[PDB]
Write a protein that binds this ligand. Structure first.
Ligand SMILES: CCCCCCCCCCCCCCCCCC(=O)OC[C@H](COP(=O)([O-])OCC(O)COP(=O)([O-])OC[C@@H](COC(=O)CCCCCCCCCCCCCCCCC)OC(=O)CCCCCCCCCCCCCCCCC)OC(=O)CCCCCCCCCCCCCCCCC
Ligand SMILES: CCCCCCCCCCCCCCCCCC(=O)OC[C@H](COP(=O)([O-])OCC(O)COP(=O)([O-])OC[C@@H](COC(=O)CCCCCCCCCCCCCCCCC)OC(=O)CCCCCCCCCCCCCCCCC)OC(=O)CCCCCCCCCCCCCCCCC
Ligand SMILES: CCCCCCCCCCCCCCCCCC(=O)OC[C@H](COP(=O)([O-])OCC(O)COP(=O)([O-])OC[C@@H](COC(=O)CCCCCCCCCCCCCCCCC)OC(=O)CCCCCCCCCCCCCCCCC)OC(=O)CCCCCCCCCCCCCCCCC
Ligand SMILES: CCCCCCCCCCCCCCCCCC(=O)OC[C@H](COP(=O)([O-])OCC(O)COP(=O)([O-])OC[C@@H](COC(=O)CCCCCCCCCCCCCCCCC)OC(=O)CCCCCCCCCCCCCCCCC)OC(=O)CCCCCCCCCCCCCCCCC
Ligand SMILES: CCCCCCCCCCCCCCCCCC(=O)OC[C@H](COP(=O)([O-])OCC[N+](C)(C)C)OC(=O)CCCCCCCCCCCCCCCCC
Ligand code: HEM
Ligand code: HEM
Ligand code: HEM
Ligand code: HEM
Lengths: 85, 364, 70, 50, 51, 88, 364
């Protein structure tokens, strides 16, 4: 791990770290249900908003393609029903 | 020294469940390797015994030879599904910055397409024979040395027993090279580490040990995806296939519609949307070569971030590929779908993966 | 003599890959391929001529011609 | 007077006569653990492209 | 030649290539005899003549 | 082109001298009307070496002690330059 | 940086031509891989049409399928000859000190023995069938599972096309594992370097660049070895084989003498010199396991030098092995040679490779 590209990068870029205090609890003292429903709600809402954002162009283009698909499908149905093939 | 085992490799904490797709693909590679080795131990490659030895010996003389065959088929299909999800995630999170990992992955993708095609050729059925014929007709369009080349590929003017035997040797050989390339894939990744949901440069205090947390997450996601996989093995065994491949090959008869497997359809579209055969070959080669990142080499290039516009365009690319596959299958009877087929193919060919910083410059 | 000839030969042929590669190809063709291989072929074909397949075929044709006209 | 009469082509010819694909003499004093050996040095006095 | 200042300039990242030395390469027309002879020589078939 | 200026060979034991120099030459072809050839034997000179040779002829034929001049290989010939008139 | 290529790895100047045996072994591995891949692209594994397609289709319909087959056979023979010389050299110069290199080498030797056996089985001739029968009968002596295991291995009570197909798949697969183990072999060697004629601890000023001097020496020695190898491919094409293998196998008829290939004879001797079958199997396993150096594991051990006495005993080992092979094949008609066969086997089993410093100690 010490001879890895990401370790080399962190040594080149980051300074010698100082003044950082981390606190960790053992999993036997942490409840798996502790922050469950709140996180479910928050993440669901976030993903709903984000997909509503980034999905709009796809929705618009899919609507245009659906219009074209309907037109072509009924054109070909009319062609087949009149022996015009 | 168990501690030394824990700390031999550390990753970011932002590995969402979407980062187990590589492990799922590994599971399916293992399944394909084992099932294929068991099948090959009961397989004879010839035009007089191949189709029979699959449906009359493998699937009816053994206890669960049918189960082994269904595993092989549906494992191929699910391997392709998982690999497509893997690629889509890599594009979504701007993982092209992992240059070694990306190049090895593209090589593996091309290899896996080749493996799937050659394997589908081994069931000497109607679809297998006529897919071989169509692809080789693509081959013979090469200027100058095409026809001779075709003969060398077939060992004759038609597909025959020697053709099946060489295809069998290729199908056996390639997956092991794929295994080596997977090893290289993982070696490069462990050299550069994983992106995660967001890209950060972390010191050892911000990273976590890979073992055993991520192995347990991989087991969990793998069991879920194996449930989904086995739903198809036992209850939709023939959903990822065409029934005409259960008809023994008839060189004198061509099927009504020759259609490849769902995971090769996009490539097939690139051939139907380009009228000139030579131009189609050239465009396919350029497409495959352009998925890579082998140019520039000695010009300074670096990678910037990705944004919401790019993510939305990626979703659009997915839509266009799906539409192109369906339409390229539909154009056989209805000729008015050429408009939408060509439109979708042109849209696919004009998708930006890497934002060229060279877009902006000044003239002398 | 050897000094001047060596200098000329080196400066003319062996100094540049643009000449050394065609010189090597000329050696491959007009010495290894069409001088040793073909040479041994011709030698073998000539040594064993009285019992050659072609000789047998010719004698057969002649004997058939003789037997037919009788 | 003889120094302003030198031609760039003459200088190039002199440089090519004595440097290109010739045997050098090397002297090393110090940590020879890192200094390349003669054989390698003899193989870099010429280039494949030329 | 490009009529653009479209290349990033870095200290010392100059004259980098694969095969030869920048500024010390022949006219590319000197390799035409090599390529011609190599193509003509290599592109030939061989048969043992077994009946 | 840049070669040596013309010189004078002098043989000691025989005591016999003679001028010499490098003569360029090329394959004959049409000439040029607007060009009178420059000094080619003594490049970049006003051609004084002829005057120096003419002046020095009496000195050399009379007998010169040229032990202070370089020799030519292992022979008995020494080179006298014609940059300046020879008096000794 | 061409210079960096020269200095990438350096070795000792005391590399006599005897240190090209590894390179020659790699040459014959390459030849075997290529010729075997060409054969397998024309091969059908089945008792009905195996012997026929080797002798009637591969050899007589292709342009030089006969030459491919002869290359493959004599390449196996010469690969074993070179490996035996390689092992003899490594024992002569006390190369058991290269612990990792030696262990990988022994694993590779076992793999190659298996590859040779499974390959010889594929020619469904008299010798192949009955060698399989004898070996699998030796399998039948295991306590409490000999018949269940034998049935599992053969797929039935008798050798058949399924057995041929298993053997074909194993023969195809094993050489690729062999290539991986060769890569590991060379990796370890580069880690610990070579011994040479004598062992010295050399600084960089006493070592030479590996490339291109030793590459050119390898080319020279390989050229000479290939001359010797081709003198057999073209003029003695069946010197190492047995004519009974040019007879299609009859399960109802047993050959007069069942003799394996000349590179397995020593093992066969161990079987013939031990009347009890279980004891013979135990001795075989112990022999193969004692060739390795996996014990002691945590006790302190180190290797001293080698001397003239050990080299003389090495010559004696060679003599005993050769005589044991010849006698093992002779004893089928001449009963009095059992004495000399047993004597040679006993002399072989008591040969000291590693002189243990534990031979000398005191008591509490
Ligand atoms: C299909 C399979 C899907 C994957 C299933 C496995 C899985 O999820 O594994 C992850 C899962 C993660 O472990 P875990 O659930 O956190 O802990 C379970 C054990 O406590 C883990 O106990 P452990 O890690 O101590 O392993 C027990 C034992 C390995 O087991 C044995 O030795 C048992 C056999 C002993 C007799 C034969 C020798 O370890 C050793 O022998 C090495 C210890 C001494 C090192 C040198 C000092 O299990 C393992 O990783 C098992 C160990 C794997 C080998 C490395 C250790
Ligand atoms: C309410 C409560 C909901 C539950 C709570 C919850 O979600 O907890 C989060 C918790 C985990 O969240 P996390 O920690 O962020 O990790 C989730 C992901 O790892 C990371 O998720 P992510 O946020 O990074 O996003 C995944 C990302 C990265 O990509 C992936 O993760 C891979 C999958 C990408 C999408 C699929 C690509 C498939 C490509 C190959 C297809 C082959 C087909 C072959 C078919 C063959 C047929 C023969 O890809 C995308 O976001 C792109 C997909 C967008 C989908 C929505 C598009 C809507 C517009 C549609 C327009 C009209 C279309 C035409 C009609 O559970 C879930 O996310 C469960 C799934 C929830 C989905 C619905 C969410 C609400 C909407
Ligand atoms: C093929 C066989 C070639 C050798 C034939 C025997 C030569 C005997 C005279 C030289 C001699 O004894 O060298 C020992 C020679 C190598 O010793 P060496 O000291 O490295 O040679 C360089 C000389 O010291 C220094 O070299 P040198 O004083 O011998 O003079 C060099 C001269 C020497 O060449 C000759 O004497 C051969 C006739 C040239 C006309 O070679 C050349 O100038 C190159 C001629 C290339 C002709 C290519 C014609 C076809 C393309 C157009 O060893 C042998 O003759 C043993 C057999 C070698 C077979 C390779
Ligand atoms: C590290 C890069 C070294 C380097 O500059 O290699 C350029 C490499 C070799 O040029 P070189 O280093 O000047 O070697 C010329 C010596 O005369 C070569 O003569 P030698 O006496 O050194 O003989 C060793 C030579 C040839 O001799 C052998 O390899 C031994 C004989 C064949 C063994 C296999 C049978 O080995 C190679 O050529 C090895 C080629 C693999 C890359 C190094 O150039 C080429 O291979 C051709 C470059 C132009 C075409 C483009 C190729 C790449 C796309
Ligand atoms: C094309 C490039 C081939 C390799 C070039 C090379 O290494 O040249 C130096 C090598 C070795 O040269 P060398 O080591 O004798 O000397 C190089 C240095 N000089 C010339 C200055 C003394 O040349 C050769 O090996 C000549 C033949 C090379 C192979 C040519 C094959 C052409 C095939 C074309 C159709 C396919
Ligand atoms: C060494 C590993 C493998 C071996 C030995 C092997 C062997 C075989 C054999 C003998 C068949 C024909 C039997 C049959 O059709 O049921 C086959 C079919 C097939 N293989 Fe493989 N295979 C291997 C790996 C793979 C891989 C990695 C893939 C790709 C996912 C793959 C895809 C296929 C496909 C698509 C078929 C035809 C499916 C069908 O029968 O309809 N194989 N393989
Ligand atoms: C057999 C098919 C493949 C397998 C088994 C495979 C396996 C893996 C594994 C195990 C990882 C690390 C775990 C992870 O991050 O998901 C990974 C990462 C990656 N793979 Fe693949 N891969 C495959 C195909 C591909 C393809 C076709 C590409 C496209 C070029 C690709 C590109 C990547 C990238 C970019 C990453 C790192 C993503 C990141 O962390 O930023 N892989 N792969
Ligand atoms: C993947 C590489 C290889 C493949 C695909 C392969 C395939 C085959 C096939 C199809 C045969 C039967 C055809 C015939 O008998 O002429 C065969 C025979 C044989 N192979 Fe291989 N082989 C490979 C590598 C090796 C290696 C490394 C050895 C080791 C020496 C070996 C030893 C043999 C032997 C002894 C025979 C039988 C000889 C005989 O025909 O009398 N093969 N192999
Ligand atoms: C596939 C067969 C084998 C190949 C291709 C192979 C290849 C090589 C090569 C290339 C080397 C380094 C070059 C040399 O010293 O000759 C080597 C060294 C060595 N091999 Fe192998 N080897 C093979 C089998 C074995 C076996 C069966 C052993 C027995 C344990 C073995 C033991 C060794 C040892 C001890 C060395 C180092 C000798 C020394 O430098 O002192 N090899 N091998």
């Amino acid at each position: 791990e010490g001879h890895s590209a990401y370790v080399a990068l962190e040594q080149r870029v980051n300074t010698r770290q100082k003044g950082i205090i981390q606190r960790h609890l053992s999993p036997y003292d942490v409840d798996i249900r502790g922050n469950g429903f709140r996180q479910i709600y928050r993440l669901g809402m976030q993903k709903i908003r984000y997909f509503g954002l980034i999905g709009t162009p796809c929705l618009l283009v899919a609507g245009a393609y659906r219009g074209i698909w309907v037109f072509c499908e009924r054109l070909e149905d009319e062609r087949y029903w009149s022996n015009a093939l | 020294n168990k501690i030394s085992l824990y700390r031999s490799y550390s990753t970011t904490i932002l590995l969402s469940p979407a980062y187990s797709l590589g492990f799922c693909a590994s599971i399916f590679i293992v399944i394909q390797i084992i099932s294929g080795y068991i099948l090959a131990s009961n397989y004879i490659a010839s035009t007089n015994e191949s189709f029979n030895i699959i449906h009359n010996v493998i699937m009816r003389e053994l206890d669960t030879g049918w189960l082994i065959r269904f595993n092989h088929i549906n494992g191929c299909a699910f391997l392709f599904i998982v690999i497509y999800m893997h690629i889509y995630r890599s594009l979504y999170h701007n993982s092209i910055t992992k240059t070694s990992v990306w190049i090895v992955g593209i090589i593996m993708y091309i290899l896996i397409c080749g493996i799937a095609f050659t394997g589908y050729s081994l069931v000497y059925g109607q679809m297998s024979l006529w897919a071989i014929v169509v692809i080789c007709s693509l081959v013979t369009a090469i200027p100058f040395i095409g026809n001779k080349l075709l003969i060398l590929i077939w060992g004759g003017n038609i597909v025959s027993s020697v053709t099946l035997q060489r295809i069998f040797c290729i199908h056996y050989l390639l997956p092991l090279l794929l295994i080596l390339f997977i090893i290289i894939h993982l070696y490069n990744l462990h050299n550069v580490n994983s992106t995660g949901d967001n890209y950060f440069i972390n010191n050892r205090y911000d990273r976590i040990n890979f073992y055993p947390l991520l192995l347990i997450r991989d087991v969990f996601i793998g069991s879920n995806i194996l449930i989904i996989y086995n739903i198809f093995v036992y209850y939709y065994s023939d959903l990822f296939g065409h029934p005409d491949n259960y008809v023994p090959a008839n060189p004198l008869v061509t099927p009504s519609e020759i259609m490849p497997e769902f995971y090769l359809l996009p490539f097939y579209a690139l051939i139907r949307a380009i009228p000139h055969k030579v131009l189609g070959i050239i465009i396919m080669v350029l497409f495959l070569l352009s998925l890579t990142n082998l140019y520039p080499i000695y010009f300074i290039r670096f990678y910037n971030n990705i944004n919401i516009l790019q993510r939305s365009l990626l979703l659009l690319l997915l839509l266009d590929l799906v539409i192109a596959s369906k339409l390229c299958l539909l154009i056989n009877h209805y000729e008015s779908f050429y408009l939408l087929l060509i439109l979708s193919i042109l849209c696919v060919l004009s998708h930006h993966i890497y934002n060229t910083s060279f877009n902006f410059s000044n003239s002398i | 003599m050897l000094a001047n000839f060596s200098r000329f030969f080196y400066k003319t042929f062996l100094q540049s890959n643009a000449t050394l590669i065609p010189l090597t190809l000329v050696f491959t063709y007009x010495x290894x391929x069409x001088x040793x291989x073909x040479x041994x072929x011709x030698x073998x074909x000539x040594x064993x001529x009285x019992x050659x397949x072609x000789x047998x075929x010719x004698x057969x044709x002649x004997x058939x011609x003789x037997x037919x006209x009788x | 007077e003889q120094l302003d009469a030198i031609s760039r082509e003459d200088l190039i010819r002199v440089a090519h006569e004595y440097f290109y694909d010739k045997d050098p003499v090397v002297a090393v004093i110090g940590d020879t653990d890192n200094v390349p050996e003669y054989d390698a040095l003899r193989a870099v006095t010429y280039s494949v492209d030329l | 030649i490009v009529n653009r200042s479209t290349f990033f300039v870095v200290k010392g990242h100059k004259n980098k290539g694969l095969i030869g030395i920048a500024g010390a390469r022949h006219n590319p027309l000197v390799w035409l005899p090599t390529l011609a002879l190599g193509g003509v020589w290599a592109w030939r078939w061989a048969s043992a003549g077994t009946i | 082109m840049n070669h040596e200026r013309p010189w004078v060979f002098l043989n000691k034991v025989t005591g016999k001298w003679g001028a010499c120099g490098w003569q360029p030459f090329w394959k004959a072809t049409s000439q040029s009307l607007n060009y009178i050839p420059d000094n080619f034997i003594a490049l970049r000179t006003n051609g004084s070496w002829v005057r120096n040779l003419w002046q020095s002829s009496k000195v050399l034929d009379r007998g010169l002690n040229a032990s202070g001049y370089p020799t030519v290989g292992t022979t008995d010939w020494v080179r006298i330059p014609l940059d300046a008139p020879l008096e000794a």
